[PDB]
Design a protein around this nucleic acid. Structure first.
Lengths: 142, 58, 48, 54, 103
RNA sequence: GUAACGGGGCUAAACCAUGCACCGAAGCUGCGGCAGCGACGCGCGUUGUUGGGUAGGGGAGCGUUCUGUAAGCCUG
């Protein structure tokens, strides 16, 4: 006998909403990565993406503990010489809030075409209104 | 007699030659091997020198 | 008796050592001479 | 006896062909030995524990 | 109905009238065999969680044919050390049929 | 070019004390095969135990050309 593996056309998608207002960032990222990876299901398989579609609401109110709010600094190199640029958390929120949670969960996901396919499902919003009521995303209230 | 039982708990690679030779003088052959030996005080000396890798049960 | 059945008795024959014919024989590249040296040179060696 | 060794050599070279590989490996006699050296590792390095929950 | 049992070191799952490859036994080509060592049994809905070696569960089996499996090539190789060695192997197997499962 | 945690991130997911679980290798156990040495017996059993290996020593084989078996045998 062989072990059962999942197929691509025998996947059951689900949709959910998570509200990150007043929640810590990393601890939220861990569960987000778990759910998008699908290790929370009973038919998990490592070469197939079966995570839910999570909609994060209120991404401009992510709570960060301690002094990280002003010491946690981001880095990214453009490619040119001396082209290293940085941005503090205190200003990254005011510039592009959703990118905070986006980058924080990307590094927790795996890398490869499936790694990117998995990130394609996450949807992050700074506001609190969303036009996805057509898909009836049941709130994962915590 | 009493026939004490000895079980070898740790390996013998990279270990001091005297302990490697006492292991054979006792009778242990690999990890987890179980043997039964007399309670003579001569045996106690070997098992005392090698007491840091042999489990005893009495 | 005919010229097919006759066979020599055991131990009365044995194949000689053939050097440098593959690896599975054990007499590979070095051929038993060891690594470079006066001995390993062809015809090179000390006398009696 | 002068041995005319072509048949056995052609046989040996054909015996080691290893199709399905790309590029010179499958055409010429640039044949690695890793294809068979990793098999023994794999037969031990299967990862079939099936730990979905605990 | 489906059950489970241990024979030859491997815990297999068998269903009424099914074929499973097991280890090389010692029986003829059509001899009857019984497996009493059962770990659990279930006939839908009812799961009869079994203590080790449940008392009563029996699986009746009938051996069909015996043979050898696929050939495997073993190669162990050491670069730059003048070493190389090969081998071949084929595991022995005994196919069975399931003729009845009782509790 | 961040670059003195591998990374994300961690106010404990960090350090100290005690406690019960668990993952974890080609280690060890369960199940099948093969081979060397020893013991005990009558060529054959039943047991002990060993089987990573360079230089190197020992044993046993496959295969190619040619002489006899062969004016025999296979082959339009």
């Amino acid at each position: 006998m062989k072990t059962f593996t999942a197929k691509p056309e025998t996947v059951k998608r689900d949709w959910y909403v998570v509200d990150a207002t007043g929640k810590t960032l990393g601890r939220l990222a861990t569960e987000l990565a778990r759910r998008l990876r699908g290790k929370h299901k009973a038919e998990y398989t490592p070469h197939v993406d079966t995570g839910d579609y999570i909609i994060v609401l209120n991404a401009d109110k992510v709570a960060v503990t301690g002094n990280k709010r002003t010491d946690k600094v981001y880095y990214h190199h453009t490619g040119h010489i001396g082209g290293i640029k940085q941005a503090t958390f205190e200003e990254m929120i005011a510039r592009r809030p959703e990118r905070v949670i986006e980058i924080a969960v990307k590094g927790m996901l795996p890398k490869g075409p499936l790694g990117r396919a998995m990130f394609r499902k996450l949807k992050v919003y700074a506001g609190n209104e969303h036009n996805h009521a057509a898909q009836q995303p049941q709130v994962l209230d915590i | 007699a009493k026939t004490i039982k000895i079980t070898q708990t740790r390996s013998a690679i990279g270990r001091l030659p005297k302990h490697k030779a006492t292991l054979l003088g006792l009778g242990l052959r690999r990890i987890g091997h179980t043997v039964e030996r007399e309670d003579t005080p001569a045996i106690r000396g070997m098992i005392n020198a090698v007491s840091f890798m042999v489990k005893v049960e009495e | 008796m005919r010229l097919n059945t006759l066979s020599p008795a055991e131990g009365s024959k044995k194949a000689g050592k053939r050097l440098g014919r593959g690896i599975g024989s054990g007499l590979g590249k070095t051929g038993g001479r060891g690594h470079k040296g006066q001995k390993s040179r062809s015809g090179g060696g000390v006398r009696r | 006896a002068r041995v005319k060794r072509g048949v056995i050599a052609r046989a040996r070279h054909k015996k080691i062909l290893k199709q399905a590989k790309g590029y010179y490996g499958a055409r010429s006699r640039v044949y690695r030995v890793a294809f068979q050296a990793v098999i023994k590792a794999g037969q031990y390095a299967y990862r079939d524990r099936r730990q979905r929950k605990r | 109905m489906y059950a489970v049992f241990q024979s030859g070191g491997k815990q297999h799952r068998v269903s009424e009238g099914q074929t499973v490859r097991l280890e090389k036994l010692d029986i003829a080509t059509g001899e009857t065999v019984e497996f009493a060592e059962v770990l659990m049994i279930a006939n839908g809905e009812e799961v009869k969680i079994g203590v080790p070696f449940v008392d009563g569960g029996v699986i009746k089996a009938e051996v069909v044919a015996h043979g050898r499996g696929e050939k495997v090539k073993i190669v162990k190789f050491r670069r730059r050390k003048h070493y190389r060695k090969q081998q071949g192997h084929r595991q022995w197997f005994t196919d069975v049929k399931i003729t009845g499962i009782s509790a």
